[PDB]
A paper describes a structure:
The reduction of substrates by nitrogenase entails multiple cycles of association and dissociation between two component proteins for sequential transfer of electrons. The P-cluster is the initial electron acceptor with subsequent transfer to the FeMo-cofactor, one of the most elaborate metalloclusters found in nature and the catalytic center of biological nitrogen reduction.
Unexpectedly, Se was not expelled from the FeMo-cofactor but migrated to the other two belt positions with ca. 88% overall retention (Se occupancy: 10% (x2B; where x reflects a mixture of S and Se), 35% (x3A) and 44% (x5A)). Both CO and Se from SeCN-, with different chemical properties, are incorporated at this site.
Residue numbers in the entry:
A (entry chain A), B (entry chain C): 4 to 480
C (entry chain B), D (entry chain D): 2 to 523
The structure:
Amino acid sequence: MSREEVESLIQEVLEVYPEKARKDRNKHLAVNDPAVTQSKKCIISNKKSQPGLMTIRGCAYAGSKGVVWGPIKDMIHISHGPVGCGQYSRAGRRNYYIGTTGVNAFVTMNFTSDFQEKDIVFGGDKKLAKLIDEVETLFPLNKGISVQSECPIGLIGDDIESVSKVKGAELSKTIVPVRCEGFRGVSQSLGHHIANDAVRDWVLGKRDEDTTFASTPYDVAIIGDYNIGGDAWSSRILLEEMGLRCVAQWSGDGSISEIELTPKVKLNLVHCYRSMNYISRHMEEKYGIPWMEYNFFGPTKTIESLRAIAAKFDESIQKKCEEVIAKYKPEWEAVVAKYRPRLEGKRVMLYIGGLRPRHVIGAYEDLGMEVVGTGYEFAHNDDYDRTMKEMGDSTLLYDDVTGYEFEEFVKRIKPDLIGSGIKEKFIFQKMGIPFRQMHSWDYSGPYHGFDGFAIFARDMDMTLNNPCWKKLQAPWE
Amino acid sequence: MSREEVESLIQEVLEVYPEKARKDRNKHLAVNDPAVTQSKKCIISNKKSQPGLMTIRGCAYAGSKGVVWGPIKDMIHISHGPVGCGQYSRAGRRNYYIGTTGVNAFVTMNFTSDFQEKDIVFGGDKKLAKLIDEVETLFPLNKGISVQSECPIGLIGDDIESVSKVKGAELSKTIVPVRCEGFRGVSQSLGHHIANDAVRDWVLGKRDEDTTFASTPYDVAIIGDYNIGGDAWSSRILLEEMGLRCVAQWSGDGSISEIELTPKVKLNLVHCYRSMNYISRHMEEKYGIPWMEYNFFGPTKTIESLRAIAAKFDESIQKKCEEVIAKYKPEWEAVVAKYRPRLEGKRVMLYIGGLRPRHVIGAYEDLGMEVVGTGYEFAHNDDYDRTMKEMGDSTLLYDDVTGYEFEEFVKRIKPDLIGSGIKEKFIFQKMGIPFRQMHSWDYSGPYHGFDGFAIFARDMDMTLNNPCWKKLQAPWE
Amino acid sequence: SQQVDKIKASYPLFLDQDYKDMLAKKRDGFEEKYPQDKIDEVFQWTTTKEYQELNFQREALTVNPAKACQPLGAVLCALGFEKTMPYVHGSQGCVAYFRSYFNRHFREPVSCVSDSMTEDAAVFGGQQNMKDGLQNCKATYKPDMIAVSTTCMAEVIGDDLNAFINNSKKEGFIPDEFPVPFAHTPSFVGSHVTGWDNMFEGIARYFTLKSMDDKVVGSNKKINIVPGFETYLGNFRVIKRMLSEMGVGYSLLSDPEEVLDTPADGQFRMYAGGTTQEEMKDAPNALNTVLLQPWHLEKTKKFVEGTWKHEVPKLNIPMGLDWTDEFLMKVSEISGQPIPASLTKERGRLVDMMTDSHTWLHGKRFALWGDPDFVMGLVKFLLELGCEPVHILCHNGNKRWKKAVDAILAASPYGKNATVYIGKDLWHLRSLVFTDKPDFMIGNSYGKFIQRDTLHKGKEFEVPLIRIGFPIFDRHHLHRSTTLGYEGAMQILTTLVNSILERLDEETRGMQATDYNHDLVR
Amino acid sequence: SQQVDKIKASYPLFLDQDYKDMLAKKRDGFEEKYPQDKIDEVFQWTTTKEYQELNFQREALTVNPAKACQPLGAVLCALGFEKTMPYVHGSQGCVAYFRSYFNRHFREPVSCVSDSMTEDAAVFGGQQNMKDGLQNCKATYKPDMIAVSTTCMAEVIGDDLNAFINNSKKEGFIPDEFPVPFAHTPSFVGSHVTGWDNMFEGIARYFTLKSMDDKVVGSNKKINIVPGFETYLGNFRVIKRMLSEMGVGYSLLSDPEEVLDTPADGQFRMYAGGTTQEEMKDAPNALNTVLLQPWHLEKTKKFVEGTWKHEVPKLNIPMGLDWTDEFLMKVSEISGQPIPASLTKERGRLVDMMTDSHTWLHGKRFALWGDPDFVMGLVKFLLELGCEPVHILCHNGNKRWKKAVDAILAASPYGKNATVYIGKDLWHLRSLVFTDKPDFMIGNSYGKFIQRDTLHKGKEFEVPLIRIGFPIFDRHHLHRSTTLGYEGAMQILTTLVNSILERLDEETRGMQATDYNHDLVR
Ligand code: CLF
Ligand code: CLF
Ligand SMILES: [Cl-]
Ligand SMILES: [Cl-]
Ligand SMILES: [Fe+2]
Ligand SMILES: [Fe+2]
């Protein structure tokens, strides 16, 4: 499709809306121009969703509890408020870890204060204090507690900070209050920021005056990898084959001690910019630790990233970098040789959260595929700035896409594959469009790194080329 | 029911038959009189079945391959002829054993010569010789081969005895020809006798001139226990606790060497008279080994048997006998205390093969139950002689019962429980009559010995008293 | 590393030596992990009676609940009405969760909207969100009805749904006659089933309260059926099938079976099937109203009895043999239709199955959980099978319900070793299956973690999970199954007995050790 | 010893120390057992390619067949006719076995008689057995038809069934008009499916050969359906359901679904349902005849084509998506009835399930066995699912069939690593699953012993069995299932994908070792 055709498509879709929604949505839809450097000339983002339009977005509690805190394995995270939020988010996100669940690790469990009417009427702070004691009794190997506020906490005027300070002092325990109520912000995004500031204020400085950890010049942290299907492990392996020491993973398979040790590293490696840029900037300000963005999706981006990272160190790391690249060359080349002919020329539309809608484009291109549309639930304009140069000319961009818009765009554009989430998957399959989950990896993965690219390729092929897709039309018409 | 009522029940049931069948069937139905010791005054047995009347009987191959030879665990038994017989009988009978199946033990496998038209037309003796070599190649740890003839072998004039002799000599292997074709005799019974004579002629004399066996005064063999659900093991344990040494089990869990060692024992203990009286008489005639009948069903019979067996030995065994009885007293007493109040007065009808229709009556009586009818598929008059004294006055006896007769007798008698086989089970359940399989033990057992009595009691209770039996009548009918 | 011919996903990739070594280095260098001996010691302690006592003393902490929040149920109820959009007034994060939860269970699209209230609404309330949200939803998704519930933000700030909807109509945002039934659904009261009851009663009121003067009980010759919160497609289907076989006129009120099972034929259908507005408007003209799941339909029952004047029969959920019999006999009484030959034979086929399978079921011990009506019907059927339902857990159960279940247990010798637990969660249930080990658990997918814990103690302590309930996320297409009626009982029986036989085969598969009992025939 | 409140059956009784020690003493004293090292050595050898080569060179020995003998199929065929007694002329041992084999699979009574020929009949033949057998059977069991087959004794001695039956009628043993169709069913030709073909063709000839004069093709506006040897009740039911939904007039010729599923209501019903004599007599007046399982209905096809002049369509078994589509399109063409909306939607629901489950099915490797039509239909559906059917075993298959399956494999890239075996048995299959290990086996209960053997090599080599086929003796009520049509495909898909997910859960259940991948949601 040409620019003019995509613009026409946008106008046609917007016709269904009442005027206020139409005028708003027009600002969140654009036709890409890779020359443009300032996306605030092209698209508005990180605004409230329009009522009634079936946004795909979540809330700040999802961004804090579900995304940043929840993966930290040796802490207990309390979903504080009524029972719903913790139950729907229990083990939904595949932030993998090694541990003994219920004993020294707690990720897939749902701890909650299960608010009842009396807690709403009279407040939940006494409940919370009693709950903390019960956690200590029944889960003695926990290494800290977080309190993930749900909608009612701030609305009723509870003071979880006081409970956290008092109990944390009484028990000599890190207890982190997190004001991630879902009424805050407009999406998951503000939950990330809130969560980063809670790490800063309650965890990260614990060892500021401790000189016992033996640092090395090659110490790094992986910042913003939540280890979906093991993604962070298949990244870490490469960083360490290159001669680095990965002191911490934030927060997939993450432990509280590795967070506390992070201020000792030489370089913060940021994968998810959206969720962790806040704490990365903080660490540069306070500890002088530099940070850099990287991308481990597909061989082109992974090789480029390994080289750029190695260039921050000495010649010995650069030499190991080239060794790593040479080791994996035949492996990814064999993946390309097998799968690229099966996928060449196929067109994909993506819709994901805050990073992957741009970050996976190189991996698709490594299989000869074209990303013809992409968009994000909760990105900011700094993410769109990074996106416009990664997307082709005249491709479609959508911020906080409505269900209606996404369906209508797909009907016109007729992509060969869609990559999005669980609320989208079954719609597009019934339309006869191969669909891959690009949050949960459709229970597959990892997708990061060289070992991840093999699985990614296998998965796009198994789905796009599956025999089921030729069968949707009954042969009697 | 009085004698006159039972007599008139028999007459009524026989009215359906044509004259020739009516006259025959009248001779195989009787009202018990425990005064009688010559059953040839009251019932005819071990005659042909009348055509078309749905006998429950099997054939001589069932009696030889299925019953006597099949359980011998370290031999390979060939079902020789077309494919049906070996397939229907594969693992149907629960003759338990310890071994590594397909390697050193072969009981639940089906080896066959799968006769085709060319084998019928030209004979199967060349196929048999080739089959033996293939067995030796693929199953090198087999300790001998039997050849279980199916109907066509004798009909076509094959000479399996010549093949067995020639191949057995060539391979220094025991290869046993068994002429158990199903056209022979009238039932399973002649298969037992055939099989016994085959053991005599081809196996039992192998160690006649070998004096190396370390014999003791307390050596016995269990003759005629096929270890259904482990029945022989729960009998053996008691004999050995009493200080005896069980050199052999014929043939449940039995090995070829233990059969060959049997002529070295001091006493043959016969459980199944019908099936193994032949070889027991042979052993007394040739080796001077005495034999005695015993019964390990229920505590009364088991205690009586232990005492009678111990009386054949010395004071040390008699003393151990009373120790065994004292040991198990609290165990069976507790079974009686729990289950007898649940079963007292309930009436049972049995129909089984050659032994159990009389042998289990004492166990029922140990639970306060009454056996109001019993009968056998293939018993001889010597079995009926042993039965009339075990059954109550005016009870019903049936030899080679027809399906029609069995149903009609049950309709009049209205037993609380029936104990019979797989071809009977589902009929009587649909009639609302609790049913227990008294061949396969309904996949339960053992039933022999003290440990078996607990399971027997549990089982009769779980079925007779099950809640399902109150539910056959729809509340609207 | 990968070999291109046999690519490894996370399992078993991370068991390769290089990954194992890496993970060991991460642990040792940076995780400051408790020593394995201390982990083992604490694990063992969590399996004990001492731990169980402390666990059951909890007053403030809930761990691994077996319930969800009201608006989930309101959404499911709403989905059962023709061309109806569920609409939850409040915070959008809730709706992403409700949709995903049902998406995972049904493996189907789940349509629901929010009006996206933010922090700014704490000053002035959500009235403007309702006005624009209703207008936007109607224009964009073209429903014929919008069924409104609430999230907990909206409940805490006190938004008056009725007034907000009225003002929306007054100011022209949606048409005066456009149906917008509503219910307050606070997550901090009851559970998801309470949200279903509230939503249903609000829809029933919307279509009938003001029009009662022309209604005559019995005049349409039908029986209304209210299913409650139901997540097996076979359950809607079997009730419709039985009533049709009997020639009984009926109206199933809230019927999502079409919209939760659209064909994959090249189009997406946002709406399919469902109870019509005409059916809800005519409902007071039925002979009577039968509640399939009365223990979470108490508000509905009060409305149906007090306003429609229907003499709602005292019937248990139609699960198992006795309660299916009772349901059919009552339906026969109300409708005047006899129970037909087809259903009598189906009943007799269930009884045949019971007679065939009784020996393996007898005395088998189960732990189980779920919503109150499901749980009590499962308990009743287990007693009918001669099984012992020893740990009966209903997190969202109440005292009156518990008394009813205790009375069912007293009517059977197979109830003698059973205890009913209310307000307890799956971390409580975990203790019970260690301290008083049953043979199996019957429960939802959250049970898999209990099975995992029990196996860790040892193979002899493992309690296998049998998946019946909601949600089931780790198997495919079990939402197609049936638990109600004779069909449901046949399905449950078959599942139980074959679970037993599968485990027995596992236990007897050991060559020369336990395979003496590896029987071909069982 | 027993503890009365926890009685042990054989498993685990014989693991008590006293029993273990006793068994060890028995072994050491008297069994002269090969040393355990030698047993292990030989076991390991039986898993090798070298052993496989020797195994596949067998010419005379068969081990663990996957077929039975002709009269078994004749009996099943005969049971499908109204008030019909199967009667096998020859030896009674055979009938005890036929009855028990089906009793164990259906968990139902199975009525069949013998005429009890003995050794004496080798002089003089079985004529008198037939005369008294027919008279006795008619008088005692009151069938409306007796359907006569043979055991191998009767075939070897050469009894002329036709002449014996005619003489029975001539001499007044049964009425001239009483129907006594017959077929020769030698066990040493073909297999049980051949006996079904032979019996059916005999019954078809009996009712039609001599009355062809008044028949006009198409005059009754029905399609005849011949199911073949079929041991899933759901398969008779689905075909009838689909044809009824489509408004197609039909006659299902041999229909045992009622007699193999009588209710447990206090009476025994020796006969129930079945094809009527009127239906067989009127069958030539149909539009056409469809063969559900054409690869074992060749003799029937020749009769239907040659005598009834029906143009039997070339249709595969209606298994999987494409072949169900073809069956419906052909039935639509023959009958003039359009394919109704209900079946179109059912189709699309299957397709939806395929899209939902494809990622777990993709690339999964299967070994499988059964009868030829069942096997080819399973192969086809596996290819439709993106699975690889790598070992395809049909003991009773033929060369023409093998060529047909090889063509089906060639039409799909998912067939590339697949081989079809005919004349080979389950001991051959055992080798294949060791040397070229698949993910799962799909087969009957005899497969359990292969799974046992594979686990003995190691957990990593275990090949789990998925039970689909005949006989299934170690699970309860699987004979109620469906494999045909869209319903059958939905059932097979669900069973396959959940088998996969069960195994994945087992492999990922290890605390801190593999449970990183023990996902709640799959
Ligand atoms: S935005 Fe929670 S699901 Fe809701 S109605 Fe309250 S219990 Fe139920 Fe985010 S924090 Fe949570 S998920 Fe929503 S409530 Fe707010
Ligand atoms: S009395 Fe065998 S089942 Fe028969 S038709 Fe021949 S193959 Fe088939 Fe006994 S020995 Fe066997 S079981 Fe019968 S045939 Fe004779
Ligand atoms: Cl968990
Ligand atoms: Cl075996
Ligand atoms: Fe779906
Ligand atoms: Fe049955």
